């Protein structure tokens, strides 16, 4: 059993070295303009944001459904999101992992940037978590296991993720997870300093305006596990300022139904001292993978998507897991906007 885990571990090292080779290849010469707007029939708007929208579209020739993320170049520039948006596309077209969203096509026109991903009708974990209330520990563990492997993958490429929350996680038709957003993802060796993320999920060292490293992702995993299993996040308040106070305080109250194993994991993930936080110690991610809360997890079977999911959203093209938005035209100027800012896209 130990030599099978050792062989497992060596398989993982070998896999990651290969994945990095292939990542760096796509990363150094990214794809561009792999489709055009007219190839798609727009169906419905699935989301809106400060500098763009997401729309359900259907490829006319293939009939496959896609989520099309449309970003207004001029607003990206005004809101100082150029680097994040360039980073999102470049990372997504370069990464390759079972629990990431699949970027199929990207292109730009005079006005907008387009990223075209395989459509996941199940929607975001957020809506399901809020409706069901909370997930049981086995259920939460299923999702958490996929985030652990995803972070082992991203971190091996020197990518800090920085955007973990139920809002950015989809539940696909097999009940498995797809991580959506990479605007805040950044290739870094060592520390970085940008104040970014979501208040409930921010590690203390982010709030304290000191540098931080990939340990913030393991902290965020702790927040995610806690929120999935309890039904509410470990640090909440009416205003972000009040949330930050609680985060830095170092005090977490656990629900009475949390198992001893879960609480012990969370104390080590929600460790205010980053130098003592699981995933940032000498044994790296293995301290998490070998923790008793994950004793029953078959990491190989999770990676290969062989475990039966505890929840499969009701299979109905369907739009019901997304809200309704006022449909507006996609505007394309007769003049090229912000051409210099987005040459690499």
């Amino acid at each position: 059993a130990a030599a099978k885990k050792g062989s497992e571990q060596e398989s993982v090292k070998e896999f990651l070295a290969k994945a990095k080779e292939e990542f760096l290849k796509k990363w150094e010469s990214p794809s561009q303009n792999t489709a055009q707007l007219d190839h798609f029939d727009r169906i419905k708007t699935l989301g809106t944001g400060s500098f763009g929208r997401v729309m359900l579209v259907k490829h006319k020739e293939t009939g496959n459904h896609y989520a099309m993320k449309i970003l207004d170049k001029q607003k990206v520039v005004k809101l100082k999101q150029i680097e994040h948006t360039l980073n999102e596309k470049r990372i997504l077209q370069a990464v390759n992992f079972p629990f990431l969203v699949k970027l199929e096509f990207s292109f730009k026109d005079n006005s907008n940037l387009y990223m075209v991903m395989e459509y996941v009708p199940g929607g975001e974990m957020f809506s399901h978590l809020r409706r069901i209330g909370r997930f049981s520990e086995p259920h939460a563990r299923f999702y958490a296991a996929q985030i652990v492997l995803t972070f082992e993958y991203l971190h091996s490429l020197d990518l800090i993720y920085r955007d973990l929350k139920p809002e950015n996680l989809l539940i696909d038709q097999q009940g498995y997870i797809q991580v959506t957003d990479f605007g805040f993802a950044k290739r870094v060796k060592g520390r970085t300093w940008t104040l970014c993320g979501t208040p409930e999920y921010l590690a203390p060292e982010i709030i304290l305006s000191k540098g931080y490293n990939k340990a913030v992702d393991w902290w965020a995993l702790g927040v995610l596990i806690y929120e999935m299993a309890a039904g509410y996040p470990p640090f909440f308040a009416d205003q972000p300022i009040q949330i930050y106070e609680k985060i830095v305080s170092g005090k977490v109250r656990f629900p009475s139904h949390f198992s001893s194993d879960l609480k012990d994991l969370l104390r080590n993930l929600l460790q205010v001292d980053l130098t003592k936080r699981f995933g940032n110690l000498k044994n790296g991610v293995n301290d998490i993978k070998n923790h008793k809360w994950f004793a029953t997890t078959d990491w190989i079977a999770i990676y290969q998507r062989k475990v039966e999911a505890p929840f499969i959203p009701k299979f109905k093209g369907d739009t019901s897991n997304f809200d309704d938005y006022e449909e507006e035209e996609i505007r394309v100027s007769i003049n090229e906007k912000c051409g210099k800012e987005f040459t690499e896209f």
């Binding site: 955007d163 929350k165 809002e167 993320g197 979501t198 208040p199 996040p233 909440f236 009416d238 629900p255």
Partner: peptide, 18 residues
């Protein structure tokens, strides 16, 4: 309960990045 305080907290919808 804590969950009730959260359900009444006003930060129960999708959360924006800072």
């Amino acid at each position: 309960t804590t969950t009730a305080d959260f359900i009444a907290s006003g930060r129960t919808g999708r959360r924006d990045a800072i």
